Write a protein that binds this ligand. Structure first.
Ligand SMILES: OC[C@H]1O[C@](CO)(OC[C@H]2O[C@@](CO)(OC[C@H]3O[C@](O)(CO)[C@@H](O)[C@@H]3O)[C@@H](O)[C@@H]2O)[C@@H](O)[C@@H]1O
Ligand SMILES: OC[C@H]1O[C@](CO)(OC[C@H]2O[C@@](CO)(OC[C@H]3O[C@](O)(CO)[C@@H](O)[C@@H]3O)[C@@H](O)[C@@H]2O)[C@@H](O)[C@@H]1O
Ligand SMILES: OC[C@H]1O[C@@](CO)(OC[C@H]2O[C@](O)(CO)[C@@H](O)[C@@H]2O)[C@@H](O)[C@@H]1O
Length: 487
C-alpha cells in the first residue's frame, strides 16, 4: 500500500554517521597524510549531557565520506574543576619534525567566576592517533592578547607554504567579533599576529576554516546569529583579499547569495582535502519529539548526524556542494517506481508525469537508504514545485522541499494540515528551466542536490519506508527519468 507507516531510526547510522549511543557534534575533519585517510574528530553529544564534563572528542576514520570506522573516545574531558571540563571545537595538524599529531581544542570552564576564562585554547598530541596525551601546562588565553575571556574558541590550524603554522580563533575585541591569528614555527611557542579578519556587524563566526583551492583563498564559517544558523563562506584571490572582505564591514560576498552553502539543518561545517577532492563535514540536527516541523524557536537542537558533502569550485571561484562520489556509488540496487495515487491536474504518460497548480503524484514506499533522481522541466522561471516525503495516501501532513523559481530559492516546509514555512536555501535558478534533482538518504537524514547549485540537507524522520511525492504549487512541470536506488 501507500499508507503512512510509523517507521523509526536505528540506534546507529553508517553513512550520515551516528554512533550507537549519542550524536555527532561539531566535526574536526583532518586528512591524515601518513595513513592517507580522513580522521574526522567530532564533539560527542549525549542526551542528556553531564552538567560540567561534556563533549569529549571522539573520532571516525574514512577514505571517502561514505563508509566510517569508529575510533571511539580520543581526547576526553577534564575533571569538573579543570579548564577543559567541557571540550569545544578545534583543529589538527601533523608535525613531521617530531612525528606527532597536534589537536588544539577549546577548554570550557564549568561555572567560571567573572574573572576566570570561560574559554581557553589547549592541546593534546599523539604519535599514532589512538593514544592522546594532554599538554597539562599549555593554555592560550585570549585575555593575554587583548581578546575576550569568555568567547575564545574553535582554533583552526593550517601551515602556509613558508612553513609557518597559523592558528585562527573565534573571539571578540572592542565590542566586536574578531578572528584572532597566532603563529608558530614549532606549534609550541605562539605569537599574536593580531586580527585575521573582523566579523561583519554584530555577527559571530563559529568553526572558522581557511584553505586555498585552485587560485582562491576561502574562509568557511558557521554563523551563530539566530536568524542565520547556516554555513557561509568568503573568498579572495590572495590571503589579503580574503581578509579585506569584512574590513570596515565591507560585506564583499563571494556570490549572489552571501556565500550561504546550505540551510539550517547543516551546521559547523569544516573541510579537508586528500589532494583530489575537498569535502566538508557538518552535522544535521535532531528534532525534539522526532517532529520534522519542530525546528526550534530561536535555534535548532545542537548535534545530530555527520553529513559529508563535496566542494565544487566554479570557474568564477564560487563554491557549491555536491554529493561525495563514494556516497553515490553506494546506491547499487534499482527499485521499481510506480504511481500509487494522483490528484488534480496530473497526467501519467509512459514514464513522464505532468502536473499543474494544485496537482500531486504519490509514488511507492521508499526503503531505508534511498537515492531518488528525476529531471523537472518547468513552464516558466516563476513556477513552483514540491518534493514531498512521509506522504502516505492517508497523511494529513507531510514535509516538502518547495522550489520557488520566482523567489530564486528552495524552502523546507510542512505541507497539508498545519502547513508552515520552516527555512530556505537560496540557489541559482536554471536559465533553461530544467532541474536535475538528486536526493541521498540514510534513514532520517537526506541531502537534496540540484544542478550543482542547490545543496539542501534536511532532517526527515520517517522518510524511510514511506511514500514520496511530487507536486506543482504554481505553473506547470513535466517530470522524467524518475529513478530510485537503495543499499
Ligand atoms: O546546545 C545544546 C548543547 O548545549 C550544551 C549546553 O550547555 O552545549 C553547547 C555548548 O557546548 C560547548 C562546550 O562543548 O561547545 C560548543 C561548540 O559549539 C559551537 O558553538 C558551534 O555550535 C562552537 O563554536 C563551540 O566550540 C560550549 O561552548 C556550549 O555552551 C550541551 O549540554 C548540549 O550539547
Ligand atoms: O505556510 C504558510 C507560511 O507563510 C509564512 C507567513 O507568510 O511565511 C514565509 C513565506 O515567505 C517567503 C517569501 O515569500 O519567504 C521567506 C523570506 O524570509 C527569508 O527567509 C529571510 O529574510 C528570505 O530569504 C525570504 O525573502 C515564502 O517563500 C514563505 O512561504 C508563515 O508564517 C506560514 O507558516
Ligand atoms: O530573517 C532575517 C533576514 O534578514 C537579512 C537581510 O539581509 O539580513 C539583515 C541582518 O543583518 C544584520 O544587519 C547584521 O547583524 C542584522 O542586524 C539583520 O537582522 C537576511 O540575511 C536574513 O535571512
Amino acid at each position: 500500500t501507500a499508507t503512512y507507516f510509523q517507521s523509526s531510526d536505528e540506534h546507529g547510522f553508517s553513512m550520515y554517521y551516528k554512533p550507537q549511543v549519542g550524536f555527532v557534534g561539531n566535526p574536526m575533519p583532518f586528512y591524515d597524510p601518513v595513513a592517507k585517510d580522513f580522521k574526522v574528530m567530532y564533539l560527542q553529544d549525549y542526551r542528556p549531557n553531564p552538567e560540567a564534563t561534556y563533549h569529549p572528542i571522539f573520532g571516525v576514520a574514512t577514505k571517502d565520506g561514505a563508509t566510517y570506522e569508529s575510533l571511539g573516545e580520543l581526547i576526553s574531558c577534564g575533571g569538573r574543576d579543570e579548564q577543559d571540563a567541557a571540550i569545544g571545537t578545534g583543529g589538527t595538524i601533523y608535525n613531521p619534525a617530531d612525528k606527532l599529531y597536534y589537536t588544539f581544542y577549546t577548554g570550557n570552564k564549568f561555572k567560571p567566576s567573572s574573572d576566570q576564562n570561560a574559554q581557553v585554547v589547549m592541546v593534546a598530541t599523539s604519535p599514532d592517533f589512538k593514544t592522546w596525551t594532554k599538554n597539562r601546562t599549555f593554555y592560550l588565553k585570549g585575555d593575554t592578547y587583548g581578546y575576550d575571556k569568555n568567547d575564545f574558541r574553535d582554533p583552526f590550524l593550517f601551515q602556509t607554504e613558508d612553513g609557518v603554522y597559523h592558528m585562527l580563533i573565534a573571539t571578540r575585541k572592542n565590542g566586536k567579533g574578531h578572528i584572532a591569528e597566532f603563529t608558530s614555527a614549532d606549534l609550541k611557542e605562539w605569537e599574536s599576529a593580531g586580527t585575521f579578519m573582523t566579523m561583519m556587524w554584530d555577527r559571530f563566526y563559529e568553526c572558522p576554516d581557511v584553505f586555498k583551492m585552485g587560485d582562491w583563498w576561502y574562509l568557511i564559517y558557521s554563523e551563530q546569529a539566530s536568524f542565520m544558523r547556516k554555513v557561509q563562506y568568503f573568498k579572495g584571490r590572495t590571503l589579503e583579499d580574503l581578509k579585506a572582505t569584512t574590513a570596515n564591514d565591507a560585506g564583499i560576498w563571494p556570490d549572489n547569495r552571501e556565500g550561504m552553502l546550505d540551510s539550517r539543518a547543516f551546521y559547523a561545517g569544516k573541510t579537508a582535502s586528500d589532494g583530489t577532492n575537498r569535502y566538508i563535514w557538518g552535522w544535521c540536527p535532531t528534532r525534539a519529539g522526532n517532529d520534522n516541523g519542530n525546528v526550534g524557536d530561536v535555534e535548532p537542537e545542537w548535534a545530530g548526524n555527520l553529513v559529508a558533502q563535496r566542494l565544487i569550485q566554479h570557474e568564477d571561484g564560487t563554491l557549491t556542494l555536491g554529493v561525495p562520489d563514494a556516497i553515490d556509488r553506494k546506491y547499487t540496487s534499482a527499485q521499481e517506481v510506480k504511481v500509487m495515487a494522483k490528484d488534480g491536474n496530473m497526467i501519467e504518460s509512459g514514464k513522464t508525469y505532468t502536473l499543474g497548480e494544485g496537482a500531486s503524484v504519490i509514488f511507492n514506499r521508499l526503503k531505508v537508504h534511498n537515492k531518488i533522481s528525476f529531471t523537472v522541466k518547468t513552464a516558466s522561471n516563476t513556477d513552483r514545485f514540491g518534493i514531498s516525503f512521509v506522504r502516505g495516501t492517508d497523511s494529513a501532513s507531510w514535509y516538502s522541499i518547495h522550489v520557488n523559481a520566482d523567489e530564486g530559492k528552495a524552502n523546507f516546509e510542512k505541507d497539508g494540515d498545519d502547513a508552515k514555512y520552516l527555512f530556505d536555501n537560496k540557489f541559482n535558478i536554471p536559465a533553461d528551466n530544467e532541474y536535475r534533482v538528486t536526493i541521498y538518504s540514510d534513514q532520517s537524514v537526506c541531502v537534496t542536490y540540484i544542478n550543482d547549485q542547490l545543496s539542501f540537507t534536511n532532517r526527515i524522520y520517517q522518510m524511510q519506508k514511506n511514500p514520496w511525492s511530487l507536486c506543482c504549487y504554481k505553473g506547470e512541470i513535466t517530470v522524467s527519468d524518475v529513478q530510485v536506488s537503495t543499499y
